Amino acid sequence: SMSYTWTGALITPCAAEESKLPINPLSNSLLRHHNMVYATTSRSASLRQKKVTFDRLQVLDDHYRDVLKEMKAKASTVKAKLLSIEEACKLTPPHSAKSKFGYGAKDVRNLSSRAVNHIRSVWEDLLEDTETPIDTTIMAKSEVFCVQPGRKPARLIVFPDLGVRVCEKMALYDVVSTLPQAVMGSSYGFQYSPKQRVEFLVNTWKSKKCPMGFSYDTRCFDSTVTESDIRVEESIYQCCDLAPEARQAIRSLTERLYIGGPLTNSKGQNCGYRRCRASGVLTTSCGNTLTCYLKATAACRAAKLQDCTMLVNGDDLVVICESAGTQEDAAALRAFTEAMTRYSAPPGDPPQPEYDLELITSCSSNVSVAHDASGKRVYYLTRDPTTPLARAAWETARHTPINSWLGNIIMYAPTLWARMILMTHFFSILLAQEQLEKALDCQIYGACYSIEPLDLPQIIERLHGLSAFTLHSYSPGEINRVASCLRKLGVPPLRTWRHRARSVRAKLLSQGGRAATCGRYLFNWAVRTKLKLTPIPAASLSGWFVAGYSGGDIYHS
Numbered sequence: 001s002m003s004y005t006w007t008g009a010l011i012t013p014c015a016a017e018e019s020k021l022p023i024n025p026l027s028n029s030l031l032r033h034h035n036m037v038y039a040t041t042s043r044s045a046s047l048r049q050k051k052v053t054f055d056r057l058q059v060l061d062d063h064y065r066d067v068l069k070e071m072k073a074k075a076s077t078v079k080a081k082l083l084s085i086e087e088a089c090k091l092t093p094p095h096s097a098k099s100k101f102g103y104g105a106k107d108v109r110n111l112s113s114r115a116v117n118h119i120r121s122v123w124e125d126l127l128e129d130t131e132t133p134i135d136t137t138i139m140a141k142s143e144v145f146c147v148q149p150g151r152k153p154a155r156l157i158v159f160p161d162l163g164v165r166v167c168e169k170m171a172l173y174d175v176v177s178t179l180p181q182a183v184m185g186s187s188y189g190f191q192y193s194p195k196q197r198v199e200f201l202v203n204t205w206k207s208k209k210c211p212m213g214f215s216y217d218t219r220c221f222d223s224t225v226t227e228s229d230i231r232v233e234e235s236i237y238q239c240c241d242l243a244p245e246a247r248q249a250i251r252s253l254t255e256r257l258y259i260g261g262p263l264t265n266s267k268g269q270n271c272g273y274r275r276c277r278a279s280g281v282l283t284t285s286c287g288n289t290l291t292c293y294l295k296a297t298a299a300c301r302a303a304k305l306q307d308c309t310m311l312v313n314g315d316d317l318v319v320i321c322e323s324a325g326t327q328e329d330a331a332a333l334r335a336f337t338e339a340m341t342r343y344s345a346p347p348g349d350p351p352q353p354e355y356d357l358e359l360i361t362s363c364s365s366n367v368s369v370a371h372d373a374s375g376k377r378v379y380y381l382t383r384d385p386t387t388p389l390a391r392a393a394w395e396t397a398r399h400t401p402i403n404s405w406l407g408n409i410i411m412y413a414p415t416l417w418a419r420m421i422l423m424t425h426f427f428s429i430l431l432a433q434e435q436l437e438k439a440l441d442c443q444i445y446g447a448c449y450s451i452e453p454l455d456l457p458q459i460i461e462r463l464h465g466l467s468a469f470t471l472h473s474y475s476p477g478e479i480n481r482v483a484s485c486l487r488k489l490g491v492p493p494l495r496t497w498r499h500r501a502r503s504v505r506a507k508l509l510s511q512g513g514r515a516a517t518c519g520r521y522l523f524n525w526a527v528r529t530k531l532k533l534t535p536i537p538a539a540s541l542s543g544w545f546v547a548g549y550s551g552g553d554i555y556h557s
């Protein structure tokens with residue numbers, strides 16, 4: 001069976017779509033080579049359609065059967081709980097797609113009579129109708145990138161109506177936030193903050209007698225997900241104690257929505273049909289994470305890998321284990337890939353055995369080493385800064401509803417590029433405009449958070465600890481990568497950023513209060529006569545690294 005069938009209707013935009021980066025004074029002082037930055041659009045959608053459309057062989061074996069049964073068994077341990085409409089509503093981010101049926105995201109969060117009446121009716125419908133496919137929209141995605149020495153086609157979101165998305169939360173938020181950890185325990189990626197993730201990868205690695213590690217990338221995880229997979233994923237949810245309306249809701253949502261369904265474009269036209277995973281549902285992150293864990297664990301047994309530890313974030317997989325020598329590790333990996341391929345999880349690039357942890361790239365990121373204030377070697381998470389920087393330049397020239405620079409500052413607070421460039425740049429900009437006290441939207445692990453940047457000292461301390469304000473003496477690889485990247489992009493050199501930082505730092509300090517605190521902590525690296533950094537009393541919220549809600553419709557004020 002095919003991943004998608006197409007009518008011929010085009011994937012259509014609905015606002016103006018912009019591909020080229022603007023030539024803006026502020027972003028130009030962050031990034032010069034402005035032609036290199038682009039945003040994907042609806043014009044390349046038909047390219048992605050050909051990539052994402054293919055037939056899917058799947059052969060299941062006894063290993064796959066057995067992991068499944070271990071998984072279900074851990075799931076029957078869990079008890080889930082219905083959200084009230086009010087709770088489900090207050091989870092909806094204010095810039096969600098409006099409904100076909102009048103009301104929009106504001107009307108949901110404000111509980112207007114129209115929206116709630118439609119939601120109630122959609123809920124009633126989900127309990128009463130078992131079979132009618134639920135319609136979805138298919139839109140291209142605008143995401144910015146830096147060019148290749150070619151250019152990526154847009155990715156495609158597939159999401160059901162707002163009224164439906166609220167109902168998903170009512171019947172599944174508590175499941176999707178709770179069951180993945182119950183099943184995979186320490187393997188569940190999204191329970192970890194960056195610090196925590198490094199702790200885990202370092203521990204695991206150093207506990208191995210002779211460690212080998214690899215990450216595995218599968219072609220199009222969403223299109224490779226067959227309806228069988230989506231059923232298995234249901235059968236796991238159904239091991240929970242669930243109120244009877246939720247059980248019935250999960251049953252209808254699976255049949256009607258998740259297993260596949262009709263696709264409409266922006267203009268209302270019949271577009272095609274879906275038989276794999278929808279990228280824009282509340283169960284996409286959790287479902288993927290589960291399908292993935294399951295297939296990888298079976299393949300590990302098939303491939304006879306020894307002492308496998310693995311960490312899973314949706315479709316992103318990393319595995320550390322006992323080396324048996326280069327030949328047989330290569331051969332084991334070949335077996336693992338072939339086992340995975342039978343499970344309808346074929347690999348993009350063939351996975352590569354790796355004998356040093358710093359060389360393992362996983363969720364775009366790797367561990368690196370630096371030194372804290374004491375001089376102790378300290379491991380932290382980093383990535384290549386090219387894409388983060390492009391999006392920073394783009395979010396500078398254009399107002400956008402998610403600020404990836406703010407997610408990158410918070411996630412990569414202890415990186416060289418985050419500290420010298422990112423912070424320096426945006427505090428300068430915000431300070432210019434007096435918008436410092438003002439709140440901004442960004443996202444961690446798919447869920448959307450509102451954040452005042454002035455609270456960055458306190459947030460960083462709680463996630464990373466004061467160490468992040470004093471890491472120094474970075475590795476040469478990291479410095480080289482960062483530096484080669486700044487030249488590629490025409491981003492001014494770190495030298496320049498230090499000079500700028502000194503000026504931001506001085507100006508914040510004059511402001512006093514919370515701003516002066518940003519100045520002392522964030523920029524203590526810019527001065528030689530350094531300030532002593534004790535904890536911030538104020539820095540003493542909960543669900544920040546619980547689960548991953550990518551594609552869900554999730555918000556936190």
Ligand SMILES: CC(=O)N1c2cccc(O)c2NC2=C(C(=O)CC(C)(C)C2)[C@@H]1c1ccc(Cl)cc1Cl
Binds near residue numbers: 362364404444445
């Ligand atoms: C989809 C998703 O939420 N993640 C993800 C997963 C895999 C690759 C990847 O690049 C990302 N990216 C990001 C993520 C952010 O939190 C925001 C931000 C800005 C750090 C980017 C996030 C992520 C980043 C680093 C790691 Cl180690 C894991 C994850 Cl899930």
Ligand SMILES: [Mg+2]
Binds near residue numbers: 220
């Ligand atoms: Mg992939």
